[PDB]
Amino acid sequence: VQTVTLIPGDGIGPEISAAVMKIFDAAKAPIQWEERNVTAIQWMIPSEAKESMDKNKMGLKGPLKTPSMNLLLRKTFDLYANVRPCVSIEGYKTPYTDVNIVTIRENTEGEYSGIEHVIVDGVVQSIKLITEGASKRIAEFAFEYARNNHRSNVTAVHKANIMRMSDGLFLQKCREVAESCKDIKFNEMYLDTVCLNMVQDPSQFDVLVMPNLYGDILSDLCAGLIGGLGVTPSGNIGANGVAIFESVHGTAPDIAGKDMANPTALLLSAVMMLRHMGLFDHAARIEAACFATIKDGKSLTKDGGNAKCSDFTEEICRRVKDL
């Protein structure tokens, strides 16, 4: 029985957290919810949130309203690896059905170095930063992820033809790690080609590892194939064994209290959270309880038909009890 710091956040954030908590309890999940309120101070997150995370090591984040809170959390906990597993959902159907891709994004560096200059009037310089350490680290994690999540392929995505020195260095590190992990099959690929083939046949891809800007785009691209941010798990891995798992959609202030919300994504992020800890039994049970609920497809939210967030949440609890 472990404690997990909880950031319900804003708008529909409380509801979907309350729905995730109730489903976790209905599924007998050995989890305690140390609720917490992240917010900018002085700039820092509060000492109580900081302390909760260094203690518990695991968290769940609902949508946070608007520096950026995400930026803040990253630098605070050294969140270096954004992971987004995209899988097609039976019942919530898109023109893409064969999808099973994990987008592994370097999260500290790359094109988001935060360094821009006005060199002269009407001439701006933006710095893309690629280091040896950060590239090696995000590579090692990708290969570690594939092993621990039983994935066959890891594809390094890049633009080394154009940006030789930077993307070439990144690529150089991915090669070294791949040589130390020959049990995973490693291939390289240009970002434009990946995009080109992804929209034609996304079943060709398995695990994508890449610098900051490409990952930021491809993660959203893949998410769009499976049906949007409203059904997409996400997880950020930090320094010395810390990890937040968030709802990566908006706060939906329109329907904050009206009980039309959809907890699916935060739930899947929680399932993903459980898998990371090692509670595979509970993860698979709740995941299957969700997919089966969506597949019936009469008791769906507005995000959908006309059944409430509670009726959806109860439907999960009904089924997850009966393993």
Partner 1 sequence: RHTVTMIPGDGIGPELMLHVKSVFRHACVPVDFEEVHVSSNADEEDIRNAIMAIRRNRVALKGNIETNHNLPPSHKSRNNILRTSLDLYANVIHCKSLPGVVTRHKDIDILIVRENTEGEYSSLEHESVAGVVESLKIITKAKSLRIAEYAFKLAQESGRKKVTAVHKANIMKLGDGLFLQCCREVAARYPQITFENMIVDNTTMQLVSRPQQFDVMVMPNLYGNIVNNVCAGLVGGPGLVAGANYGHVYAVFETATRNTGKSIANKNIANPTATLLASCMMLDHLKLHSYATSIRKAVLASMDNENMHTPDIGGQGTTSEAIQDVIRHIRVING
Ligand X SMILES: Nc1ncnc2c1ncn2[C@@H]1O[C@H](COP(=O)(O)OP(=O)(O)O)[C@@H](O)[C@H]1O
List the interface residues with partner 1, window 123-152 (CB under 8 A): 123-133
- Is 54 one of the annotated binding-site residues? no
Nearer to Mg ion, 102 or 279 (CB): 102
106 binds Mg ion (CB under 5 A): no
Name which position in 106, 216, 287, 303 contacts Mg ion (CB under 5 A): 216
Judged by CB, which is closer to partner 1: 30, or 91?
91
In the complex, the residues that contact ligand X under the rule CB under 6 A are: 190, 193
Q: Are strands 58-61 and 2-7 parallel, antiparallel or unpaired?
A: parallel
CA distance 269 to 181: 28
Please report where in the chains the tokens 């609902």 appear, as a residue.
62
Q: Which residues contact 212 (CB under 8 A, 6 or more apart)?
A: 105, 106, 107, 108, 109, 110, 111, 112
Give the residue from 103, 24, 50 showing the smallest Cα distance to 289: 24
Residue given tokens 């080109």 in the structure block: 196
Phi, psi of 314 (to 5 degrees): -65, -40
**Closer CB to ligand X, 221 or 286, in the complex:** 221
| Residue numbers 200-239 binding partner 1 by CB under 8 A | 200, 213, 216-218, 220-221, 223-225, 227-229
- The identity of residue 86, as a single letter, is C
Is 74 annotated as ligand-binding?
A: yes
Task: Give me the least distance between CB of 68 and Mg ion, in Å please.
Answer: 12
Compute φ and ψ for 300, nearest 5 degrees: -110, 155
318 is in an annotated binding site: no
Choose between 122 and 278: whose C-beta lies nearer to partner 1.
Answer: 122
- Chain contacts with partner 1 (rule: CB under 8 A): 94-96, 111-112, 116-118, 121-133, 158-166, 168-169, 171, 191-193, 195-200, 213, 216-218, 220-221, 223-225, 227-229
